[PDB]
Every structure is written in structure tokens, then in C-alpha cells.
Amino acid sequence: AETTLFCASDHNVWATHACVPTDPNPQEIHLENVTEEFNMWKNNMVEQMHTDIISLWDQSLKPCVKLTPLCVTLQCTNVTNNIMRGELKNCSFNMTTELRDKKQKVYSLFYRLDVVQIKEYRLINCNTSAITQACPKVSFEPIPIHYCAPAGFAILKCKDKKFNGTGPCPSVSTVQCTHGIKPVVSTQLLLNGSLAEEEVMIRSENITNNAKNILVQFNTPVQINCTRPNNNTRKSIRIGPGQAFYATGDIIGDIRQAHCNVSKATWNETLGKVVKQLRKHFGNNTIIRFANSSGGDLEVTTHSFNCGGEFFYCNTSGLFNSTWISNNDSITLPCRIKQIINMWQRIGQAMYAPPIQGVIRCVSNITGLILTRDGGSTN
């Protein structure tokens, strides 16, 4: 059966106010001689979690300033630098002063992904959607949440290791509710999650199907470390009565490209475990390649995520570039920051993530991957 569940949370977008706190100690009952048929692909907890996360995002973004005047013509010179690629744009614009009859010529430092030409540029979302600035105090850090069933329902956990996503689970337990799910919004690599028990776990709805993604779960985490080395000072511009807009006023020196590092010595033999478990499915003689990315939107071609409040888009063309045959150097991934974010594949509700002052660092755990096969491959 399907039922609505509530949090058990121990300022954030994932508000802990309008749902109950956690029990002091979990109650886990091991159901002996019970073999229940799980199917995570038809799971309704995933859909309820997705709807709840979208709702929390909407309720967090709702009581904060709409940046309606920002969709104007922008005189965008390149930011002061010696150089190949001008990624940061120094855009000046007329903005509405708190008095309706007065204007102010202000400026900001936008990104190249946030502006499209018409020297006259405009914000990328003026064509398609209205924009709402995220609240600066409100933090985007994931927080654990446990989804707990109401009275008359129970949650069965599959304590059995080596568990395939579908089919019978010989070792079933009942829990009041789950562990910290920690809702990280990322693509191409699962960050901050469960780390399995025995060996790397390959799970797909149909292995033969290409159209359905492959979820890989790691044994040991692969540590990924980011920096946005730029300073990106924040400045407030009063765009109306009681309404403020936070712009990247200036950058203290060394305009450098953002990046997240992975260890080469760990990512190799992590991919070794992955290709071993994949050859378990596709025969013990097939050569297994990993390729850059097929294509698509920016959110999919690049490992996109939120580090320290800023939205990174890391290339990861060096990670997935390997050929595997049956028989302290770091991989640096150049990431691109972006402020105009269209979350949950929704068009109509954009969002302006404010600048974060100073430098920001990831130290996160790659605990899994999402993949897709290439199709074809007759024999």
C-alpha cells in the first residue's frame, strides 16, 4: 500500500518545522522466517519523497524577493583580466530605486551561462520564466530526514546484503522509519549516500534495456574536493521598498576557474570494481568502456550539484574516459558556476542563487554513479 509519511528531522530549505522530530533511539525488529518481495522501481516512497522535496523547495523560495526588474538590457563588458574565454561579464544596467520615479545605474558580475546576447545582453530566463531570488540566510546544505509511516502501516527494511533492487529479500526487518536519507540534488554521481556492505552493487530496472539508467553503489567513498577560488564579494542593491538584490560587486584577485579534484589512485580500482560487477552481467570477456557524455542539457552533460550554496557544473570528461579489457596525482575536473537555476526540470519557476562571499570548498563523498549503456552492440 501507499501512504503519506512525515519527517523525523533531528533555516535550511529542508524545513524541520512543519513535521515532527526524531525518536531518541530507533526500534528495529528482525522478522525471522520472512521473505518479502521488494521492487524499488515501483516504490511509492520515491515519488512521495520527490513531491515532498519539490514542495519544500517551493515553500522555501516563496516568501522572498522576485527579481522582476532584472530582465533589462545589460551593457556587459568583459571582467578585468589579461585573457581564451571570458566567463565572467561586468554588466551595467538601470535598476529601479526604492522611489518609483528614480533609477540607478548599477553594475554586477554575471556569468556567461546567465546572459545571452541580443554588447547588449539579457538574463537567460527572460524569454521563458519569472525569477525569484533565493533567500541569503536560507542555506542549501542537505539535512537528514527519515520518512515515517502513520499508524496502521509499517516500514520493512531489507537487511540482507548483496541485495538486488527487485525480488525476494530473505532477511526482512521492520523499522519505525529510515536512516538519514540526506537529499543531495546531483547528476552523474551520487554524493553523500549509502556505501554498501560486501561489493559494488549494479542495479537497473532492465539490464537489457538502454532507456533505463544504471545505478552503481560503491564500497568505499571516492573523496571529491572542490574550490571556487574566486572571492566574489557580495553587495546589496535596493531594487524596491524592502526588496534587496545581492550582486557580485567585485572579485578580489586571481580570477581562476572553479574545479573539483578526484584522486586518480582511488577512482582507478573503483572503476575496476565497477567493471568487474558489470562484467558479472555482460559476460566475462566483453571490454567495457567509459565515455565522456552523450550530450544534452548542461545539467546532464556535466556533474551538476550544489557546493557551499553555489551551483557547480563539473566537466568529468577525465573521470569517465577508460577502456577495460578482460585479463598521488589528481584528476582535476573544471566546473562552471551558475546562478540562474531551473530545478526539478521545471520551466516557469527559475531561481537566482545569491553570491556566497569568500572562497568555497567541497569535501564530499562519491558513493555511487548513474550510467546509461550505448545500445546497439549486436555481438
Epitope: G253, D254, I255, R256, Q257, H259, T332, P334
Partner: antibody
Framework: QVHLQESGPGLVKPSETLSLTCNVS????????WSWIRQPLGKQPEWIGY???????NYNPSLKSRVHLSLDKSKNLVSLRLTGVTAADSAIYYC??????????????????????????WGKGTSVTVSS | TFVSVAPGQTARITCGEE??????VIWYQQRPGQAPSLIIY??????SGIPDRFSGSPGSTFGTTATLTITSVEAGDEADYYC????????????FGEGTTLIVLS
């Protein structure tokens, strides 16, 4: 030791090419980066480009097509031809030697560095003047 | 500009604009009736044979003008000083910096 001696016309008319020639003694021409600096009287020096083998030359954007530098390996000489001289060109000239570097400040693979030059040793001086 | 300092005392010379990036300042020294001469490159690395008395402010700091410290100055240092600046967030400056004339009272 490295000795630099510069010889030129001494007095050149406007719109007539000036040839300043510098002889180096102590090291081979192919093994070092050669620089030219023009100092107007009472003002700061002004770097007017450097020359090397394998086409590693960047001249001043102001004197882009005017000054040209050439090298003579057999004679151990370096020549400068400055075209279209004016009254403002009357200045002391020095023929110096640059040793480069790399002030790294970033990831290096993303080309987050720049190469900086400095005059390790100096010449003598040649106050070339222009009379109309 | 002109700066005058007695023997045996520190003299601070500021040359060029404010810092904006990872900056490399090369401090020269032109004696009267003499060619320029290197005294500092890479903001602290003196060349071979130059006295260790001179020092320079590091380029790792942003928004601060280049500063040359000359401690226990003597008669030899009475000369001009032109600083060549290499900022990462600025194109190459093919003209040297505004010189400063260190004058010893002796």
C-alpha cells in the same frame, strides 16, 4: 661575464630607418633572451620587445610595425631597425638580457600562470637623438 | 616623486598602482649617468651578488601598492628606482613604473 656594446648612427633624420646594432661577448646569442629598452630623458624606461630563436618575439603594441629585431648567430650580433622615427624617439637605448620565469597562481593545467621577464645584466647606453 | 632618508634608516618606496591579482614586481635601480641594474625580481628574490638589505612586499596580497624596503641605507643607494609590474589581471605593461629618487643626506 657578459658585455654588451651598442653602436648606431648617432643622428638620424625623421622618416628614415634607424639601425642600432648590439654585440654580445661572453655567451652565445642562441642561448639567451635578448631585450631592448628605450629610456626617454628624465622619464622611466620603456620595454620595446624581445627576440629569440623559434619565433618567440612580442613587441610593444605602440611600436608594433615600427621596431623589428633580428639576430646574427655567426657574427654574434643583434640588430634593431626602427622605421618612421620622430622627435619623441630621441632617447637613451640599452641592450639587455632577460631571464624568464613562471609566476604560477593556479591549477597549471588550466593555464593559470604567466611568464615574467627581468633584466639580469645591463648594457652601456646609446643616446640616439633625432634632428629634423 | 622624491624621497630623502638619513643613513642607517629604513626607506619605503611605493611605485605603481594598487594590486589586483597575483603580482610580480621587479625592482630596478638606475644610478646617475649609469644603466639600470636589477636589485629584486619576483618581489623577494635578489639576484646573485646584490646585497640582501633590500626587500619587497609579497605579491600574494591584493589591493596593496608595491613597496620596496631598503634597511640601513648607504651612499651607494642614492639613485632612481623603477618597478616593472606583472599583474595576472592586467595586460603586460611595456612601460616601466613611475620612478622614485632615493636621496641620502650625506
Amino acid at each position: 661575464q657578459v658585455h654588451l656594446q651598442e653602436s648606431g648612427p648617432g643622428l638620424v633624420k625623421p622618416s628614415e630607418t634607424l639601425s642600432l646594432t648590439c654585440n654580445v661577448s661572453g655567451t652565445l646569442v642562441r642561448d639567451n633572451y635578448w631585450s631592448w629598452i628605450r629610456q626617454p630623458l628624465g622619464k622611466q624606461p620603456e620595454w620595446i620587445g624581445y627576440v629569440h630563436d623559434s619565433g618567440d618575439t612580442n613587441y610593444n603594441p605602440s611600436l608594433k610595425s615600427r621596431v623589428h629585431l633580428s639576430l646574427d648567430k655567426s657574427k654574434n650580433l643583434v640588430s634593431l631597425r626602427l622605421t618612421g622615427v620622430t622627435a619623441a624617439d630621441s632617447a637613451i637605448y640599452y641592450c639587455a638580457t632577460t631571464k624568464h620565469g613562471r609566476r604560477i597562481y593556479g591549477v597549471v593545467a588550466f593555464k593559470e600562470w604567466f611568464t615574467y621577464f627581468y633584466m639580469d645584466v645591463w648594457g652601456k647606453g646609446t643616446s640616439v637623438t633625432v634632428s629634423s | 616623486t622624491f624621497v630623502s632618508v638619513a643613513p642607517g634608516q629604513t626607506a619605503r618606496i611605493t611605485c605603481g598602482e594598487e594590486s589586483l591579482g597575483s603580482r610580480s614586481v621587479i625592482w630596478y635601480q638606475q644610478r646617475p649617468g649609469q644603466a639600470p641594474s636589477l636589485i629584486i625580481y619576483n618581489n623577494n628574490d635578489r639576484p646573485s651578488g646584490i646585497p640582501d638589505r633590500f626587500s619587497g612586499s609579497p605579491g600574494s596580497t591584493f589591493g596593496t601598492t608595491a613597496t620596496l624596503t631598503i634597511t640601513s641605507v648607504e651612499a651607494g643607494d642614492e639613485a632612481d628606482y623603477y618597478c616593472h609590474i606583472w599583474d595576472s589581471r592586467r595586460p603586460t605593461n611595456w612601460v616601466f613604473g613611475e620612478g622614485t629618487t632615493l636621496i641620502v643626506l650625506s
